[PDB]
Each structure stands twice: as C-alpha cells, then as structure tokens.
Design a protein around this ligand. Sequence first.
Ligand SMILES: Nc1ncnc2c1ncn2[C@@H]1O[C@H](COP(=O)(O)OP(=O)(O)OP(=O)(O)O)[C@@H](O)[C@H]1O
Ligand SMILES: Nc1ncnc2c1ncn2[C@@H]1O[C@H](COP(=O)(O)OP(=O)(O)OP(=O)(O)O)[C@@H](O)[C@H]1O
Ligand SMILES: Nc1ncnc2c1ncn2[C@@H]1O[C@H](COP(=O)(O)OP(=O)(O)O)[C@@H](O)[C@H]1O
Lengths: 48, 286, 533, 547
Amino acid sequence: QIFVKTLTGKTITLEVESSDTIDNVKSKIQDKEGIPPDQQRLIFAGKQ
Amino acid sequence: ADIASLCSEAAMQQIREKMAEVLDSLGVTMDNFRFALGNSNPSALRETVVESVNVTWDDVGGLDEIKEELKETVEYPVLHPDQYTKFGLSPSKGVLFYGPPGTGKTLLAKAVATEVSANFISVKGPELLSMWYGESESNIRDIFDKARAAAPTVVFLDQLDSIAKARGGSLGDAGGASDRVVNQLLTEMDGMNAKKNVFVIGATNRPDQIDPAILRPGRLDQLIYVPLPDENARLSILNAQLRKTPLEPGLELTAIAKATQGFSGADLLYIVQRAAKYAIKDSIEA
Amino acid sequence: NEVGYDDIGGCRKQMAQIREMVELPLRHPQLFKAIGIKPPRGVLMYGPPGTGKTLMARAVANETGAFFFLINGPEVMSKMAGESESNLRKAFEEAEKNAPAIIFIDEIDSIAPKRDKTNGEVERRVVSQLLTLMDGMKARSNVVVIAATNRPNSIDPALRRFGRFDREVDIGIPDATGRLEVLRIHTKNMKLADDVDLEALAAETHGYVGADIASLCSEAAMQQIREKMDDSLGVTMDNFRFALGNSNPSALRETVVESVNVTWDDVGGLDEIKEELKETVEYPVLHPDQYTKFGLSPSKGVLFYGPPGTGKTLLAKAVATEVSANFISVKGPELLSMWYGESESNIRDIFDKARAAAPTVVFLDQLDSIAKARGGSLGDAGGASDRVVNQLLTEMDGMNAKKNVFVIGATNRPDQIDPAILRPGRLDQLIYVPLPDENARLSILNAQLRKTPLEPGLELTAIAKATQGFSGADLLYIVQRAAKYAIKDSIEAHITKEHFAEAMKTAKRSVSDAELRRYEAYSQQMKASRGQF
Amino acid sequence: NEVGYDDIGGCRKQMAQIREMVELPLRHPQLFKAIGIKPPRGVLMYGPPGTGKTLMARAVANETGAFFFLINGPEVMSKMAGESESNLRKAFEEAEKNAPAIIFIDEIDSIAPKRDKTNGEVERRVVSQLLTLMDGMKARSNVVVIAATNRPNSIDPALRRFGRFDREVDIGIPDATGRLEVLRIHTKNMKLADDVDLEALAAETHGYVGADIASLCSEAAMQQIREKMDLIDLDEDEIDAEVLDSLGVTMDNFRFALGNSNPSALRETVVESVNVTWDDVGGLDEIKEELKETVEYPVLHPDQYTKFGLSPSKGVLFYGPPGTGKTLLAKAVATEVSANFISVKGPELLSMWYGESESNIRDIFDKARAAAPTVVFLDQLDSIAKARGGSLGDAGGASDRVVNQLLTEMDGMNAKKNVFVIGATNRPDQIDPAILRPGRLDQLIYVPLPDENARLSILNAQLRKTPLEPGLELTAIAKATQGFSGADLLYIVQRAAKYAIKDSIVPYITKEHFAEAMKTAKRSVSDAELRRYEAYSQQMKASRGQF
Ligand SMILES: Nc1ncnc2c1ncn2[C@@H]1O[C@H](COP(=O)(O)OP(=O)(O)OP(=O)(O)O)[C@@H](O)[C@H]1O
Ligand SMILES: Nc1ncnc2c1ncn2[C@@H]1O[C@H](COP(=O)(O)OP(=O)(O)OP(=O)(O)O)[C@@H](O)[C@H]1O
Ligand SMILES: Nc1ncnc2c1ncn2[C@@H]1O[C@H](COP(=O)(O)OP(=O)(O)O)[C@@H](O)[C@H]1O
C-alpha cells in the first residue's frame, strides 16, 4: 500500500565548432566563379 | 513469412541426410517436415499466444443442455448481425456457470469462441490482486481496449470466490480494500461497449455466497447449473484421446459409469490416461 | 602461421553443424539444389566470452581459404555517426573481391540492444544501415556473414528474421572430455614430465573455459620457472596443483549445462522407483512414437516428499544418465529469494535456453509454496508472495512438446498441499521417498569410505540395526565426527575402531519421530486415494 | 636524475615479485623456447595513493637498461580524440625497433573507468583504440607494458583478461622497518641534529605512507625556519649568510609535525593484521586448545587433512549468553593463525550506498586470491537478521541483497586459498535458517559465562592503558555482578575515572573509587538466559540442521 518516487537529471550539451581542414581550402582557392556575359579572360603570347 | 522458410529448413536436412545422382534426395519426406516442425520457431511463440485453438464439440461427451444455451448468446449476434437490430434490442452479454470442479465448465468455454474463430482470454480470480494499494483496477480496464480492437474476442473470468464473496461480510482492513476492488468490474459490466461483440463467461464454485449485484440481468442472467455429466453420456467422452483398440470396448466402461453417481467427469477420463501404466508399458518390450 | 580443425576442441555437436552450415553454400552453389538456391546466411553464434568464438570461426575460414574480415561492435560504435555509416559500407564492399569470403561481426548486442530504454533517431540509424545492405547483397555473391554475441535475447528481434538472421548456434561450456581435449591442444608444445595428471584437474574445472585453461597452463609453468634459477627444466604436477589453488573462477552466475556420468548404483536401494522413471521418460527421448500410437502426452512435473535433504540432489543428478541428456540444477528457495521480475523472467530465460540445449532436464525443490503463497495481497513483499502462483500454472503448461524439456520437483510435507493442481496428467508422478534400508545406506557408506583408507577390522552393521531416526544423509556426519580424532594423533607427535563409540549415538540426528508417523499417512492411501488425498 | 634500487624501500619483498616477473622476458628469452608458453606482457600495480608506484617504474627501467618511455594519465585526456590516438600509436612503434623496451603507462583509471555506470561515447573511444592495439600487436619484440591505478576493480573488467593484463600486483603500506628506510633517503641532504633517533620515528607514525613521511619532515624543517624567524628577518636579502649552518631539525619539531598532521590513507581498516592475544582476556582456556584443533591444524598439514576425504573446517560460531566476551573476542581471533583479517559488521561496511554494498566483500575475495591468506569474521548475527529477513512458515527464505554474493563464492574457494569465516552471535534463537546449512557451520565452539570468580584477571589486562594506584582493591569488584563482561566493565572504570574533571581549579586515583563503586552492582545478563544454552552445548549435534 506504498509508493516509490524518484526524479531525474540531465546535462544538455557542449560544442566546439571546429572545421575547415587545410586541404579543403587549398582546393577551394583554385577554381572559378563565373563571369556575367562578355567578360572574357584572355590568353596572351610572346617571347619568341 | 515463416512458411517460406520451413520448406527450405527441411530441404537442407535432405541434403544432410545423404551428405539425379544427388538430386533424388531433393524430394522431401513427410517426416522431415516433422523434423522442421520439431525444431520450429513459431511466430506466435515470439510473443503472447492469442491464437484460436482447434478444439471442437466432438471431443467431449455430454453437457448438451449447456451447448444448446451457449449457441444463442454469442453466436447469434455474430452470425446474423441484422436480427437484433430489427427489434432494436442487443442480446444478453454474459453467462454464468456454477458447480463441482470435476466437470468441464472452464474447459468447454474454449470451444465456444473458437467455433466462429474468436479470441480467448482466460483470467483467474486469485491470479491478479491488490498487492500494493489500488494496483488491480488499472489492470482490469487495461484489457478492455484490446478486446474490441482485435474483435471478435471474448474474456473468460474464472474463480470469482476471491472477489464476489465480500459485499457486507468482511469488515476488516482487507474488507475495506475488498470494497475498492469489486466496484471496478461491477461498473465495467454495464459500462463496456456491448456492440463490439465482447462477452464475459464465468464459471465459479460455491454458488450460495455470490454477490447480488452480479446476478442481475445484463451482466450474468443465464443461470446454468453445471453438475457432473449424466451416467449414460460418459462413453462419448473417450472418443477423442483414443480411437484404435483391437478389442473394441464400451460396455465395461459404461458398467463402472452406471455403478455410482459419485464418479466425476474427469476421473473417468483418467482411466485411459493411465494406459501408459496399464497397456503401453507391457507392449513395447520388443 | 594459421590454424585448423585440430586447434580447437570440446565443441563438437554444433561444430559439426557449422562445418556444414556454411561450407554447403561456399564450396558449391550448383550442387545444393540447381533449381532454386536458398542459402540461409547470417549465422548467429552466442555464448559466454572466452569460449573461442573467433578461433572457431577462423578454423573453417583457414580450412577453405576464406578471407576472414573482422570488425567489432564498440570499435565502430564509438566513432562518428556519419563515419560508422561509411565504414560499414567499406566493410561490405569486400564481398566481391574475395568471394567466397567470410565477414565476421562481433558485439551486436551493443549495436542492437533491447528497445525499451531508448527512443531515438541516431540509436536506430546504425541498425537500419545494415538492414539497407542485407537486401543489397541478395544477388548471390557467395558470402556468409557471421554474427557473434553473448545471448540472443539481447539482440533486437527485428534483426532475427527469416532472410536476414535465422541460424542460431549455441556455444556453452565443454564436458569432462571437452576441457580434457583443449588441455591437449594448449600443451602440444609444453615439455612436461611423466607425473602430470590429465583427468583429475579436468573434471574439477566446473565453471572454467578454454580461455581459463590458457591461463592455467601459463601460470603453472611460470611457477616452475620461479624455483629453478633462484637445459635444466622440468614441469611436475605440483605446479598445476599450485594453479588449482590460484585459479580464477569466472563462470559462476550461470546454471550448469554439462551432463554427468554418475550411475544409479551410487545410491543404495530404491530400485523400484528407478524402473518406474525408466518406463516414463527415457523411452520417448529415443522414439516418441509410443505416446502417439495411443494418443498420450509426456509428463510435465514430478514430485518427491518425505524426510527432507536425504540425498535427493544426487537422485536429480542420476536421471540425466539413463536418458542420455543434460541436467539443469535450479535451487530450492530461489522462488522466494528472487524479487519481482527475477521470479518470472529468470525462470523463463533458462527455459528457452533449455530448448536450445535439448534434450535436458530441470530440477526444482521446495514445492510446498503453492498452498501458502496463493493469495498475495500484502503491501510488503514483491515477487516472493504473488508473482509465483500466477505463473507456475502457465509456465508448466507453456512447453512446446517437441524438444522434451522436463521438470524434476521435490517437496517436504504434502498433507497441507491442495489437490486441485496435484491431479495426474500434469503433476502425475508424485513419489514418497522412504527411509533407506540397512543395505541401502551402507552401500552409500561404502562409497563414503572409498575416499579414505580403513582397516578391515571395522564393521558398519552394528550401528545400522538401531536406526529409528537415522537416514542415509543423517549418517553422513559419521565420517566427520569419528574421523576428527584420526588427524590429531598423527600430526601432533612430529581409521581404527576406537572412535566408533564417540559417533555411536551423538553423531547426528535430524529425522524426528513426530513426522515419521506422518510420512505413512499418505503412503498407506496411495493405492485408494491416489487422485486427491 | 635517475633512480636505482636504493632509492625505494619498504616493498622489498613486493619488489622482488615484480623483479623476476619483468626481467625474465627482457634478459633471457631462452626459457620461452624451452617451456613453450607465452610469458606475460601486461602487469598492473595498485594500492593506496602516495606509495611511489611511479618511482618504482623508473627504478626498474634504468637498472635493466631497456628503452624507457612514459605515458602519463591526464596528458592523454587533455587533448581531443584525434591527436590522442595518434600519440598512442607513435609510442608503441618506437619501442618495437628498440627491443627490449618498457612502455610504462600511468593512471589507467582516468582513461578506463567503470563503463556500465555511465554508458557514454568517450568511455569506449580511447580504450577500444588501445585494446585493438594491445591485443593486435605480434612481433615477438618482448616488450612489457606496466599499468598503475589506485583500485583494481575501478577499471573496465574487459582489460583483466588473458593475454592483456593477467598478473595483479598489490602495493601495500610499509612496516616499521620499511617506513624507516623511506625517511633515510629523504634526509640525505637534511642536516638533522644528533638527538634525533632513527628508530623512534618509525614507531611514531603507524599508518603513514611514504608521501606522508616526506611531507612530515618538510613541515618539521619549516618549523625550524619559523623558530629561527626572530633571529634573522626576511628584509635582508640573504645578507647574513653565516648563521644558516646552525639549522638542525631536532626531534621535538617532528613531535610538533605529528601533532598537526593527520593520516591520509587510513580511511579504511587495517590491511595486514591485528595483535591481541588470548592471554589479554582472562580465562576461557577450555576453548583455547579446542580452537587449536580446527583452524591451525589444516593450514600446517594440508595433505593429511584432505587425503581422508574430510571437508575443511571453514566456519565456526560463538554463541551462549548475550554480550559476554564474544564482542570482546572480536579482535582476539586473528593472532592465533597470524593471518590477514578484516572485520565486517552490519552498520559498518554493508550499509553504504547501492553498488558499494558488495564491493567490500569483493576485496576479501581478492584477499583470498591475490593477498592470501585471509580471515573473515562477522559479529552480532542477530542485528543482521533484520537486513537478511526471517523465514516464516514452511516455505520461506532470506531475500537479501548481500547474501547472494556471500554464500556462492564462500564455498567455491578451495582450501589452498585459506578462507576462514568466523561467526559470533549473542542468541542462537535469533539466527536465520536460510543461511545455515550443513557444510558451513559444522564446528561448535560454545562460549560459556566469562568466569565471574576469575574476572579480576580480565580487568587486570584492561587497566594497563593508564597509570593506576599500586594499592589496588580487587576483592569483590566483578564477582558480584555476574552479567557485566569486559565490555561493560568499562562503565565501572568510567565510574572511578570521571571525577578527575571535578574538584579542580591533588589525588587522582584513590582506593575509595573502587570500594564505593559496588553500589551499582547490577546484572544485565541473567542466569535465565545462560541455562537455556548450557544444555544446548551438549545437544547441538541433534540440532545441527535447520535450527
Ligand atoms: N571451445 C573453446 N573455448 C575457449 N577457448 C578455446 C576453445 N577452443 C580453443 N580455445 C583456445 O583458448 C583461447 C580462448 O581465447 P579466445 O579469444 O578464443 O576466447 P573468445 O571468448 O573466443 O575471445 P573473444 O571474446 O575475443 O571472442 C583461444 O586463444 C583458443 O586458441
Ligand atoms: N621506496 C619507496 N617506497 C614508497 N614511497 C617512496 C619510496 N621512495 C620515495 N617515496 C616517496 O613516495 C612518493 C612516491 O609517490 P608517487 O609519486 O609514485 O605517487 P603515486 O600516486 O604512486 O603516482 P601515480 O600518480 O602514478 O599513482 C615520493 O614523493 C617519495 O617521496
Ligand atoms: N466432458 C468432460 N468429461 C470429463 N472430463 C472433462 C470434460 N471436459 C473437460 N474435462 C477435463 O477437465 C479439465 C478442464 O476443466 P476443469 O479443469 O475441470 O475446470 P474446473 O476445474 O474449473 O471444473 C480438462 O483438463 C479435462 O481433462
């Protein structure tokens, strides 16, 4: 004719937010992004 | 899904029995299915067993006045559902048995539900009680919701000599707890949904001290006395367990049946249960 | 530098299964059926740790040259969530470059535990990834995965399904010749002497395993190195006797599964009840056609009642020899000592384990609790009052009648027990154990005097003629009361009949006389009032 | 600075066990080829803190001349999960090419705690990386890994398996000759005085570890600075550098250092023994030679006691009149066999929080195996019946939390592990029958009424802790009580000694303090309870079963 009562407790979280390895950024630089319409980029030649 | 595996579970034993030159063993045998049934993993065995058993009415002998009464209460709503709606009165839900513990009053109730393929839930009186305080009324209404969801089901309340005896006699501390546990099922007999073909079947000894609010109509009104079966209807009991006898008896078994009226309906069933001590013992030494 | 079939032992009956359960798809997919091939890969092996589950899986792999890829539960569980999803795909991509291969997966109970405590997405992610690739390898790539854990009830039941996981292999403790066999394996290079023993320490290891055998041979050999320096090496039996007193019993909280070899002639007398038990249970275990030719059922539970503690445990030991099966020893007061849940789930966690270890027999004691613990409505006790009576009516009739699990029961006072459940058919073989005869207990005492030397001028029938309240177990203190003086006179100054008078009357008395006249109150009416009493 | 053999002390018997266990796979691998079994690779040291276990690992590495590398505990957990596994892999690779080598790791409890109490993510990350690297390596490079912690069962139990960590080594506290050797190493540079005795300070600190002795002398040397504080102040920046040579730490500064310090590692009971003889209690000689026939006979002759098929006499009991010397005999039962002994009591050790109520009995089972021999003793068996529970009717039992771990492993240990349970109750009618069985308590040692005519010899060895009067009065001090044993005899002593605080601001002990003390001559242990069990002492052989 009796009872059992017990509560609980929690811990939410911690974070660091660590990212961006160096090998991904070196591949991130050597690319293209697009050029409007007529914004050619050119070639050039010389030094015969 | 299990049947898709049992054909393969017996095919590999046929290969294991040997090790058209090796494909003649691929023809499965009837005992390798019994070997597959011998190491069978039943899907109903992985949880609680709520299936319908294959018992019928020819396995018992006698008790035919109960059989003609128990063919109208729970079968006529489910076989002809439009008959009681013409008069607008639903049939009575609840049948009560009372008598000696020798007859089959708790054992023939499984043949009532399994005829129209209904589920069977058997609960005992002194099985669940109020251990702590109030731990029984929550365990009574917890089966009423699934009794109507998987319909047709029945529920078999048994041995009510622990609850239906205390109305105004016991005035102790257990009697105060007795007044708290008997009004749960008394209000649930008329508070249940009677249009979902849920039925209660009772079979309780000592029929003198039953509670007066349970013999009222609507809950238990079929006053069906179940004594030991008649002395001429005791030969038809033994048709189920044994069928093969090279001497064909049946007049000596009725001689001891007609000798006295004190023989029970289960004691004369045990005269062939002792065959392993009488006839099968001295016939297997070869 | 690999292993084979001779490097493991003990496990033979289910090893003969697993040597053909996986070789039949791997050696030849054509000669299986050649019309429809149904390989039931996904074998689930289970058992206590240290049984050599990994070594017995590498035995069939190195025999057929199969590539043994190995992963483990916590080594891929404790990684990143997205990394464990990729690494499982990196583990199952080896099924095409090494086919026929073997993929060993261990500790799945840590991967897929019971689903009561957790309700989560990431907790069900690692078990749904293997569901999505189990049907991905259904193109008959001739690979068989191996699942190794501790017990099948810890795995989630949706994994155990016909098509994914159906094969179950139980690995238990070896028998008396099993740990003898692994003792020969681990001592293939052990340079021992001629005085070493092979059978006494093997049968003495009850709760030990071959991994514990591997620590036994190394610790005993290390003790031999300690007292040599302080080729001149030699290992005696006394180094292993030092390992007997310095062993580490690990398997202790498990019921014994091993079968015994004790004969019925170890106990004296009661020959009329050994033939009655031989005419009931040891005939249908070889062929159950006797119970089906006339439509009968085997026995569910037996009883013993009379003088308590008179050697019914050794009678429960000897029933597993004429039936050629195992034996399970469940203690007497464990029905009350186990709490709520422990009195219900633990008594059925051995029953399905007994179904996997069929044929076997189970022993129970103190069956006088049915008439005293029925109406449980008190608010003090838990599973010791009401959670026993509600389940013995169901669990005794909750068998399958296809693997023949048997229950041996024994009580003390049957006059207070209600005859409602004691009818034959379920509780049929209710037996009265009587007081043993004069030739009965001296046949036991001849086995009790076997372990010690004795002069031939001693006689045991002089004390047997006045045994009014002395049973066989009541006279077991004679070898303790009388023989306590034979040790003192031999070790103080740097077996006879002189101490037979000190154990003549004041040795031990347990059987009283009030219940002695009550022991024949039911036995005189066992022929007339056999049904109820 | 490097350390050798002389820089440690106290554990010289314990160091020799670690000596032969690690120097044989390093120096002479030819014994492995001769006997054909794998030598161990991982040892584990444990014990109380401050016993110099890190100093012993540096001592065994430099003297053997192997390639020593140290991996400290909290330096691994100070990093994240990525670089800690890379640093653990680099340590094992350089020791393989430098064989023989010793890879000593420290503080394994911070890396491997008990995992089942906190089911977490990082609790199986660094230990699973270590377990596949420890069991996975195989190159016959005969390298040894040494572990160190403060508790053997605090770590994860999967590490204590075969092949990884098998040999457990306990590091106990030093003895009187052992703690003397610790201070002699630290006082090599301490300019002590001539009056400081070497052996006197060993008997002063009874339960001090070597870290406590090293902090004791530094605090006593710091008191020498504050004693000479008024001689030269701190304003002069070491100007008078000529009086510092007269700085001798004389011995009463160590007496002041003992007065302020406290024992740190004495939060538990004694780990070695207790020493109180049977002659310290008066009489009871009818059971002295009787107990010599049951507990010291099998440990001296293990062959003649067991070849006759007799069971080892593991358990005795003490019963009779309640509170009549059996509580006084709680400590005087270990010095006969002179083995290790730890007393257990209901409200003492088994009434803690959940989870630790069975770990205390686990320590006496590690003392049955790793620290053999052992002596178990439980007193006041009627107070523990409230926790065990009483069996009622014909169907009962003791449903207790602690008796399941007790009764199973107390019978599984053989006679070579030297297990000895001792019982002492106050009434045999208050004993639970579920614990009693034939095979555990078959030895009857009846304790009678403790010699009320000769009880003057009991109190003669009780008043030896105080300077008393030479003209004592021992005529009828304890012969008129007949129910007041040596435990309740202290109340008569407390009557004759509580008057020292009164009549003060002189006589201290007079003859009237014992002559007038007979006015409270009562009897708590009546003769009605003794005579029920005096006839039971000759008829317990017919009642040695259930009750
Ligand atoms: N049936 C057996 N049981 C236990 N050990 C065996 C058996 N047969 C052989 N052994 C040998 O004893 C050793 C036991 O250790 P083993 O690692 O095999 O146990 P295990 O429980 O399979 O290990 P794990 O838990 O890592 O799978 C093995 O190295 C093996 O060579
Ligand atoms: N032979 C010796 N035995 C015991 N103690 C010693 C000995 N020699 C020196 N000591 C003292 O004991 C201390 C050694 O303790 P140590 O630095 O090992 O702490 P520990 O807790 O054992 O290390 P860990 O943190 O690895 O557990 C030293 O400070 C030293 O003064
Ligand atoms: N017609 C019958 N004749 C004899 N015995 C029967 C009959 N029907 C059932 N039994 C026996 O009775 C049992 C089922 O009913 P029973 O247990 O007697 O219920 P109760 O004990 O409540 O009367 C079965 O085990 C069966 O052997």
